Write an enzyme that holds these catalytic residues in place. Sequence first.
Site, PDB file in Angstrom:
ATOM      1  CD  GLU A   1      -9.219   2.079   4.202  1.00 40.09           C
ATOM      2  OE1 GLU A   1      -8.324   1.215   4.298  1.00 40.09           O
ATOM      3  OE2 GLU A   1     -10.311   1.867   3.638  1.00 40.09           O
ATOM      4  CG  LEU A  42      -1.740  -1.264   1.477  1.00 37.73           C
ATOM      5  CD1 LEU A  42      -2.554  -1.128   2.753  1.00 37.73           C
ATOM      6  CD2 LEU A  42      -2.644  -1.581   0.290  1.00 37.73           C
TER       7      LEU A  42
HETATM    8  N1  LIG Z   1      -5.778  -0.304  -1.644  1.00 37.47           N
HETATM    9  C1  LIG Z   1      -6.408  -1.469  -1.512  1.00 37.47           C
HETATM   10  O1  LIG Z   1      -7.711  -1.545  -0.994  1.00 37.47           O
HETATM   11  C2  LIG Z   1      -5.692  -2.727  -1.904  1.00 37.47           C
HETATM   12  C3  LIG Z   1      -4.486  -2.642  -2.579  1.00 37.47           C
HETATM   13  N2  LIG Z   1      -3.831  -3.770  -2.976  1.00 37.47           N
HETATM   14  C4  LIG Z   1      -2.552  -3.622  -3.692  1.00 37.47           C
HETATM   15  O2  LIG Z   1      -2.575  -4.267  -4.950  1.00 37.47           O
HETATM   16  C5  LIG Z   1      -1.286  -4.775  -5.263  1.00 37.47           C
HETATM   17  C6  LIG Z   1      -1.401  -6.245  -5.646  1.00 37.47           C
HETATM   18  O3  LIG Z   1      -2.209  -6.370  -6.795  1.00 37.47           O
HETATM   19  P1  LIG Z   1      -1.651  -7.136  -8.093  1.00 37.47           P
HETATM   20  O4  LIG Z   1      -0.196  -6.885  -8.185  1.00 37.47           O
HETATM   21  O5  LIG Z   1      -2.530  -6.820  -9.243  1.00 37.47           O
HETATM   22  O6  LIG Z   1      -1.860  -8.677  -7.689  1.00 37.47           O
HETATM   23  P2  LIG Z   1      -3.167  -9.481  -7.209  1.00 37.47           P
HETATM   24  O7  LIG Z   1      -3.364  -9.382  -5.745  1.00 37.47           O
HETATM   25  O8  LIG Z   1      -4.350  -9.007  -7.953  1.00 37.47           O
HETATM   26  O9  LIG Z   1      -2.833 -10.988  -7.632  1.00 37.47           O
HETATM   27  C7  LIG Z   1      -2.532 -11.329  -8.965  1.00 37.47           C
HETATM   28  C8  LIG Z   1      -2.342 -12.835  -8.972  1.00 37.47           C
HETATM   29  O10 LIG Z   1      -3.561 -13.474  -8.631  1.00 37.47           O
HETATM   30  C9  LIG Z   1      -3.723 -14.664  -9.387  1.00 37.47           C
HETATM   31  N3  LIG Z   1      -4.888 -14.517 -10.273  1.00 37.47           N
HETATM   32  C10 LIG Z   1      -5.214 -13.405 -11.007  1.00 37.47           C
HETATM   33  N4  LIG Z   1      -6.366 -13.650 -11.668  1.00 37.47           N
HETATM   34  C11 LIG Z   1      -6.792 -14.893 -11.347  1.00 37.47           C
HETATM   35  C12 LIG Z   1      -7.909 -15.626 -11.729  1.00 37.47           C
HETATM   36  N5  LIG Z   1      -8.796 -15.109 -12.576  1.00 37.47           N
HETATM   37  N6  LIG Z   1      -8.090 -16.897 -11.229  1.00 37.47           N
HETATM   38  C13 LIG Z   1      -7.163 -17.434 -10.359  1.00 37.47           C
HETATM   39  N7  LIG Z   1      -6.060 -16.695  -9.980  1.00 37.47           N
HETATM   40  C14 LIG Z   1      -5.876 -15.445 -10.467  1.00 37.47           C
HETATM   41  C15 LIG Z   1      -2.447 -14.829 -10.195  1.00 37.47           C
HETATM   42  O11 LIG Z   1      -1.571 -15.530  -9.344  1.00 37.47           O
HETATM   43  P3  LIG Z   1      -0.484 -16.581  -9.881  1.00 37.47           P
HETATM   44  O12 LIG Z   1       0.679 -15.797 -10.450  1.00 37.47           O
HETATM   45  O13 LIG Z   1      -0.014 -17.435  -8.726  1.00 37.47           O
HETATM   46  O14 LIG Z   1      -1.102 -17.460 -10.939  1.00 37.47           O
HETATM   47  C16 LIG Z   1      -1.924 -13.416 -10.310  1.00 37.47           C
HETATM   48  O15 LIG Z   1      -0.518 -13.416 -10.436  1.00 37.47           O
HETATM   49  C17 LIG Z   1      -0.420  -4.594  -4.027  1.00 37.47           C
HETATM   50  O16 LIG Z   1       0.431  -3.491  -4.250  1.00 37.47           O
HETATM   51  C18 LIG Z   1      -1.398  -4.240  -2.927  1.00 37.47           C
HETATM   52  O17 LIG Z   1      -0.836  -3.302  -2.035  1.00 37.47           O
HETATM   53  C19 LIG Z   1      -4.365  -5.007  -2.733  1.00 37.47           C
HETATM   54  C20 LIG Z   1      -5.572  -5.123  -2.048  1.00 37.47           C
HETATM   55  C21 LIG Z   1      -6.237  -3.976  -1.623  1.00 37.47           C
HETATM   56  C1  LIG Z   2      -0.299  -4.802   4.207  1.00 42.10           C
HETATM   57  O1  LIG Z   2      -0.858  -5.378   5.388  1.00 42.10           O
HETATM   58  C2  LIG Z   2      -2.187  -5.667   5.230  1.00 42.10           C
HETATM   59  C3  LIG Z   2      -2.785  -5.610   3.967  1.00 42.10           C
HETATM   60  C4  LIG Z   2      -4.143  -5.892   3.816  1.00 42.10           C
HETATM   61  C5  LIG Z   2      -4.813  -5.854   2.424  1.00 42.10           C
HETATM   62  C6  LIG Z   2      -3.784  -5.532   1.341  1.00 42.10           C
HETATM   63  C7  LIG Z   2      -5.457  -7.215   2.150  1.00 42.10           C
HETATM   64  C8  LIG Z   2      -5.867  -4.835   2.401  1.00 42.10           C
HETATM   65  C9  LIG Z   2      -6.759  -4.000   2.327  1.00 42.10           C
HETATM   66  C10 LIG Z   2      -7.828  -3.049   2.240  1.00 42.10           C
HETATM   67  C11 LIG Z   2      -7.798  -1.896   3.010  1.00 42.10           C
HETATM   68  C12 LIG Z   2      -6.635  -1.636   3.967  1.00 42.10           C
HETATM   69  N1  LIG Z   2      -8.803  -1.014   2.914  1.00 42.10           N
HETATM   70  C13 LIG Z   2      -9.834  -1.235   2.083  1.00 42.10           C
HETATM   71  N2  LIG Z   2     -10.818  -0.343   2.015  1.00 42.10           N
HETATM   72  N3  LIG Z   2      -9.885  -2.344   1.325  1.00 42.10           N
HETATM   73  C14 LIG Z   2      -8.902  -3.255   1.380  1.00 42.10           C
HETATM   74  N4  LIG Z   2      -8.963  -4.345   0.617  1.00 42.10           N
HETATM   75  C15 LIG Z   2      -4.889  -6.271   4.930  1.00 42.10           C
HETATM   76  C16 LIG Z   2      -4.295  -6.346   6.188  1.00 42.10           C
HETATM   77  O2  LIG Z   2      -5.039  -6.732   7.265  1.00 42.10           O
HETATM   78  C17 LIG Z   2      -6.191  -5.888   7.405  1.00 42.10           C
HETATM   79  C18 LIG Z   2      -2.943  -6.036   6.341  1.00 42.10           C
HETATM   80  O3  LIG Z   2      -2.337  -6.128   7.567  1.00 42.10           O
HETATM   81  C19 LIG Z   2      -2.928  -5.230   8.517  1.00 42.10           C
END
Ligand SMILES: NC(=O)C1=CN([C@@H]2O[C@H](COP(=O)(O)OP(=O)(O)OC[C@H]3O[C@@H](n4cnc5c(N)ncnc54)[C@H](OP(=O)(O)O)[C@@H]3O)[C@@H](O)[C@H]2O)C=CC1
Ligand SMILES: COc1cc(C(C)(C)C#Cc2c(C)nc(N)nc2N)cc(OC)c1OC
Length: 225
Positions: free
Chosen positions: A30, A23
């Site tokens: 949040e 992140l």
């Molecule tokens: N701000 C927020 O609310 C959130 C932010 N994030 C951020 O997003 C970033 C990560 O996202 P990203 O890099 O896109 O990676 P993802 O978390 O989206 O994972 C991608 C991987 O998931 C697997 N995958 C993708 N599509 C499919 C499918 N259709 N069926 C089965 N498996 C699938 C594949 O794994 P494989 O290679 O093993 O096949 C692929 O390499 C991080 O930087 C994180 O911080 C993440 C969650 C929340």
């Molecule tokens: C990077 O560490 C964490 C990341 C995350 C991920 C990346 C899964 C997330 C998220 C997320 C947040 C923080 N806010 C909202 N609105 N949506 C999400 N998916 C969850 C965690 O537990 C809550 C984490 O540890 C605290």
Amino acid sequence: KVPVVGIVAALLPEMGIGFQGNLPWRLAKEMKYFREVTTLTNDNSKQNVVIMGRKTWESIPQKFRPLPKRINVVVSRSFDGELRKVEDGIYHSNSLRNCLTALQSSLANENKIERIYIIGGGEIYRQSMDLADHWLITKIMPLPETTIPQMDTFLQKQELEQRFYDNSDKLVDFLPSSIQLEGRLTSQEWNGELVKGLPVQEKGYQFYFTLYTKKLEHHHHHHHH
Ligand SMILES: NC(=O)C1=CN([C@@H]2O[C@H](COP(=O)(O)OP(=O)(O)OC[C@H]3O[C@@H](n4cnc5c(N)ncnc54)[C@H](OP(=O)(O)O)[C@@H]3O)[C@@H](O)[C@H]2O)C=CC1
Ligand SMILES: COc1cc(C(C)(C)C#Cc2c(C)nc(N)nc2N)cc(OC)c1OC
């Protein structure tokens, strides 16, 4: 008929969500909102599901995973089946779409699931636009003197506003009743766009908890035998 809900925190206006596997920010309040939303249910006998891509799973500190009191599902192209228990609280799936169809089965889930939360991955969110019923998007804005963080992953904002509308007037009602928030429904302008939701302020950021709902659909065809 289990609601599929995307939940994400995104920095306006480009809606950045991640940078270099993590992140771009660290906001306790949040995080807490996310933990409570995905964990709490209106029915005590049910739990929520959290589905996530592999890379997102690997970004969670090993001490905090799997996320407690929620069914965790990690999806990877190289996993064996559509849905299999591999550990206590951890399911593996090689398909996001099939994984969902599996979860919806009332025979398998015993109606013991309330909501399915897609907790992210840029690649996952990108595929969830046609899958999710709603979106819980925390819109984040840097305060006047705050440095915009560097980001390399983004939410599909075009797809979002094409399929969904800002239903934030219904956020409070939509959340599990147990949850309580500090702010009240506010509506303000930022960089041209209208931002509406429950306002919070932590560190150098101002953010809004918002809710997006599927836009009304025309009736073109219903399948008959
Ligand atoms: N701000 C927020 O609310 C959130 C932010 N994030 C951020 O997003 C970033 C990560 O996202 P990203 O890099 O896109 O990676 P993802 O978390 O989206 O994972 C991608 C991987 O998931 C697997 N995958 C993708 N599509 C499919 C499918 N259709 N069926 C089965 N498996 C699938 C594949 O794994 P494989 O290679 O093993 O096949 C692929 O390499 C991080 O930087 C994180 O911080 C993440 C969650 C929340
Ligand atoms: C990077 O560490 C964490 C990341 C995350 C991920 C990346 C899964 C997330 C998220 C997320 C947040 C923080 N806010 C909202 N609105 N949506 C999400 N998916 C969850 C965690 O537990 C809550 C984490 O540890 C605290």
